[PDB]
Write a protein that binds this ligand. Structure first.
Ligand SMILES: [Zn+2]
Length: 140
């Protein structure tokens, strides 16, 4: 589990979105595993605006933050998980690292801020749903 809180926005994995998230929907995209809902309170996370390929992610299943290299956001074929079939996921970045289903929502961060959240795992790879292209999170 985990979210990003920027401005009046809450960013979560679409497959973990709550009723309250859907009842306050701003934007969602199944192909990215993302959903954004509106918040009453201001959040304090900063979204990275960059093309970094190194950062640190939180892995809840090891109680650890791991420094990783990660790939460019791309359309990647992902094996079946407990929450999606095998499919193409868009705007996904991979690193070599541990990722359980419960690790979804863990933050990947670089020097510029939050890059994205854990979305995929297996075969010794962790996949992150990029948010750096969602420039509208910075405004309105
Ligand atoms: Zn960066």
């Amino acid at each position: 589990s985990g979210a990003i809180y920027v401005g009046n926005y809450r960013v979560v994995n679409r497959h973990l979105a709550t009723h309250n998230d859907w009842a306050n929907l701003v934007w969602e995209d199944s192909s990215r595993d993302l959903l954004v809902s509106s918040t009453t309170a201001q959040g304090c996370d900063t979204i990275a605006r960059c093309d970094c390929q190194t950062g640190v992610y939180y892995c809840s299943s090891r109680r650890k933050h791991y420094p990783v290299s990660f790939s460019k956001p791309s359309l990647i074929f992902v094996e079946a998980s407990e929450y999606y079939p095998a499919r193409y996921q868009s705007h996904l970045m991979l690193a070599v690292g541990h990722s359980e289903p419960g690790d979804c929502g863990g933050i990947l961060r670089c020097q510029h801020g939050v890059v994205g959240i854990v979305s995929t795992g297996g075969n010794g790879l962790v996949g992150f749903a990029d948010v750096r292209d969602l420039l509208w999170l910075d405004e309105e």
